[PDB]
């Protein structure tokens, strides 16, 4: 290839490339940018890097890295035999004396294989594998580094047959290098093999025995990279293959218990993982016998902040988090059986005069809370007032962890008399929300949200107090916490409901919300807590939200509109245009449904001006279930609020509702059934033409195990409603349901729903009395839940019950009535008689 004039130009350009002052390097930044699109230039780059020994390491390496960026951006462009020249030069120089040159070459190869593509370098893998065998150590190491990077980057491409089947050659090749002299090499080998465990890729699986043997042979390797890789190997293996590990299990946990205490905290982390993974397996209890008593203290010891973190404070997975996690899981496995092991530890840690210890103790308390709750109940009356005291602790990390652990005992706290625990707890938590430290602000805010979730309407007496602090936070908050503050406020709204609406409360709350609202861009993810917060505030405030509605309504529909528009654009030009992030759509639909409910009937003026339904029609057809879900919720809410604007759309909508039942998605199925139910009421007899799309499915649903409570209730309700508007189809199906219908509906509060549904079961029963006879018990018991029926409903029940009585004959009505539980048989005579 050419040289010798432009060569000097490249040399000079690279010289200026590294220069002390910004001016020169910006000028050559421009020169570089312009030249970067010409292939000949790149030929010069690889030439300088590999072939020119005259130049210093830094310069060559820089040539290589600039070339590397040139691949990174617009590699697709430059023409073949150039690219092939680069490839060849790279592969011939892979082993190189200079560590820096070797690294550059590596990143080049790596970036070419990732970018241009794996198929587009056909001979790469076989070449690297042939290089592994080399007598030159450096070539061996560079080839192995490349292979490792390649395995990490694409496992899935490698396990596919698009490459043919490379792993079939590579994996057995890798296993032969576990025995290598160089620790770097062994490290590379087991690292490469590790990518393929969870996949259960054929090559590894068929060689599994070889693998595990060589793994054991490496167990005692001094070198921490090797130990660490072995540990990873054993964790993943544990996950995928229980069988081949079983015989060696005890020795293995003996080893892991040792690695967990390892001097090098990386090895220690990778080992500690093992307990997290083992606690998921069903045989855990059996394997952990006789290692458990040591294992727990070990985990409790790893749970204090490492010294580096103690310095940094006063972000990511560390020994402490893994230990804590493993302890939580275990405490869920052993439940109350763990307490004899934990209690002594807690006794020494909790009251300790060294705050790191105390902290790790409180952490332990929190972690074991879920699994050990029952066994811990006896000790709470002593502990909780102690934690409430800790929130006042001089050290911040103590305050925060205390907030969390208390939060984990919140349920027990609200289940007790409010003045002894709940009240102090709330006062002190509120104090801590305003804490001068941000970590404590976030922890306290989260805890408090947790508490609000746990005690609802119990908060009411204290509402003003709470608001006083909450809004004040608006002034003190750095916006990282501000989001947690929104979540706190939304949770407050959800918990106290309509008690939230008073002029002073709204005047206090709204301005700062509106403030952050105005100043957030439609592109900003931080909108999510803010709108999810308003969504709940609005449902809570109801009519009192009127002043603030128009602007928020508009913004939501805009958000939904832009996201849809962007989705289609992306669909059309996916290379030129980037996909929308549908979360904005979801949050926006949420807020919308949130106004539709509690503003209901007052959105009419707004909806009448909107394309909102034209958009919803698209949302329902979206591949992403959460969108469909929010969308059907909205459909129901509008259906209630203003039906006039829906009625046009019910023709197209219904078929869509009918293909969205699909109980595999619970929330979707639910919101869709609910929606249908809301349609029928407004549609009266006009619902006639389609039952048939929905019915068979609804019956299949209400009869399905194992179906979540709410889905079943909603199903029964809408079926009842369907039978209420259109008893002619519908009702002549029963005992296909109504066992489930009744068993479900009997557990629901008395309200508009199930008033509708029961009126429907009655007008359905007039039409097909034959079906309800087989089990009439379920219906009696259902009529019996019913503390306060509407007089009409009552009378219906009377007519039906008496009808049955006279029908079946008296006395043998009573042979039937004899299996009535006391309260049932009594209420039946009391309200109806009988």
């Amino acid at each position: 290839k050419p040289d010798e004039q432009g060569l000097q130009q490249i040399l000079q350009l690279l010289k200026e490339s590294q220069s002390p002052d910004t001016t020169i390097q910006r000028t050559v930044q421009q020169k570089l940018e312009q030249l970067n699109q010409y292939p000949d230039f790149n030929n010069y780059l690889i030439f300088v890097l590999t072939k020119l020994k005259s130049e210093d390491e830094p310069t060559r390496s820089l040539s290589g890295l600039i070339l590397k960026n040139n691949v990174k951006a617009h590699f697709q462009n430059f023409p073949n035999g150039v690219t092939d020249f680069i490839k060849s030069e790279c592969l011939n120089n892979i082993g190189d004396s200079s560590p820096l040159i070797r690294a550059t070459v590596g990143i080049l190869i790596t970036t070419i294989a990732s970018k241009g593509e794996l198929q587009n370098w056909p001979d790469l893998l076989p070449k690297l594998c042939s290089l592994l065998d080399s007598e030159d150590y450096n070539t061996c190491e560079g080839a192995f580094g490349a292979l490792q990077k390649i395995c990490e980057d694409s496992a899935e491409i490698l396990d596919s047959d698009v490459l043919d089947r490379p792993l079939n050659i590579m994996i057995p090749k890798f296993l032969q290098f576990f025995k290598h002299s160089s620790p770097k090499i062994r490290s590379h080998a087991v690292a490469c093999v590790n990518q393929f465990i969870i996949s259960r890729t054929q090559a590894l699986m068929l060689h599994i025995d070889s693998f595990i043997e060589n793994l054991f042979a490496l167990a005692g390797d001094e070198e921490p990279e090797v130990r660490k890789n072995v540990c990873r190997a054993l964790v993943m293996l544990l996950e995928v293959r229980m069988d081949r590990l079983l015989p060696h299990m005890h020795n293995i946990v003996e080893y892991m218990l040792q690695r967990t205490q390892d001097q090098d905290e990386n090895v220690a982390l990778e080992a500690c993982e093992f307990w997290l993974t083992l606690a998921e397996q069903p045989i855990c209890k059996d394997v952990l016998v006789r290692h458990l008593p040591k294992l727990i203290p070990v985990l409790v010891n790893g749970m204090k902040y490492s010294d580096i973190d103690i310095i940094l404070l006063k972000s990511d997975w560390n020994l402490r988090k893994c230990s804590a996690a493993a302890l939580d899981v275990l405490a869920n496995v052993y439940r109350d059986e763990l307490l004899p092991h934990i209690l002594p530890l807690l006794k020494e840690l909790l009251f300790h005069h060294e705050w790191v210890v105390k902290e790790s103790g409180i952490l332990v308390l929190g972690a074991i809370a879920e699994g050990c709750m029952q066994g811990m109940i006896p000790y709470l009356p002593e502990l909780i007032p102690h934690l409430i005291q800790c929130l006042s602790d001089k050290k911040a990390l103590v305050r925060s962890i205390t907030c969390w652990t208390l939060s984990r005992y919140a349920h027990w706290v609200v289940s007790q008399p409010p003045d002894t625990y709940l009240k102090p707890l709330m006062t002190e938590l509120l104090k801590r929300i305003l804490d001068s430290n941000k970590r404590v602000q976030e922890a306290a805010c989260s805890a408090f949200a947790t508490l609000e979730e746990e005690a609802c309407t119990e908060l009411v007496p204290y509402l003003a107090y709470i608001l006083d602090t909450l809004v004040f936070a608006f002034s003190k908050y750095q916006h990282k916490n501000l989001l947690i503050l929104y979540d706190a406020i939304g949770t407050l709204a959800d918990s106290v409901g309509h008690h939230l609406n008073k002029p002073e409360y709204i005047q206090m709350l709204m301005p700062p919300l509106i403030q952050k609202w105005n100043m957030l861009k439609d592109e900003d993810k931080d909108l999510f807590p803010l709108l999810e917060c308003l969504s709940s505030v609005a449902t809570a405030l109801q009519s009192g939200f009127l002043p603030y509605c128009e602007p928020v309504y508009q913004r939501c529909v805009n958000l939904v509109q832009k996201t849809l528009a962007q989705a289609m654009l992306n669909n059309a030009q996916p290379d030129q245009y980037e996909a929308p992030d549908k979360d904005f759509m979801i949050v926006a639909l949420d807020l919308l449904s949130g106004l539709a409910e509690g503003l209901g009937g007052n959105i009419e003026q707004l909806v009448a001006r909107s394309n909102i339904l034209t958009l919803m029609y698209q949302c329902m057809q979206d591949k992403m279930p959460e969108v469909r879900q929010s969308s059907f919720a909205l459909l129901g809410d509008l259906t209630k609020a203003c039906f006039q604007h829906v009625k046009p759309c019910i023709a197209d909508f219904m078929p869509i509702l009918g293909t969205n039942l699909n109980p595999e998605f619970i929330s979707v199925c639910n919101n869709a059934t609910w929606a249908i139910g809301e349609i029928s009421i407004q549609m009266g007899i006009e619902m006639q033409p389609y039952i048939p799309m929905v019915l068979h499915q609804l019956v299949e649903i209400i009869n399905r195990p194992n179906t979540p409570k709410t889905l079943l209730e909603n199903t029964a309700i809408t079926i009842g409603r369907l039978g209420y508007v259109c008893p002619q189809e519908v009702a002549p199906m029963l005992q296909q349901f109504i066992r489930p219908w009744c068993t479900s509906l009997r557990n629901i509060r008395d309200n508009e729903e199930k008033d509708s549904a029961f009126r429907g079961i009655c007008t359905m029963i007039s039409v097909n009395p034959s079906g309800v006879i087989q089990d009439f018990i379920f219906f009696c018991d259902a009529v019996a839940s019913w503390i306060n029926p509407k007089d009409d409903l009552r009378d219906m029940f009377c007519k039906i019950l008496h009808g049955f009585k006279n029908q079946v004959g008296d006395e043998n009505w009573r042979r039937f009535s004899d299996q009535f539980p006391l309260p049932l048989k009594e209420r039946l005579a009391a309200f109806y008689g009988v």
Partner: peptide, 19 residues
């Protein structure tokens, strides 16, 4: 027996936790 919110869960995932 209303709509399903999924919002409280989002709030949960955003909450502070030690591990």
């Amino acid at each position: 027996p209303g709509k399903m919110d999924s919002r409280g869960e989002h709030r949960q995932d955003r909450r502070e936790r030690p591990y």
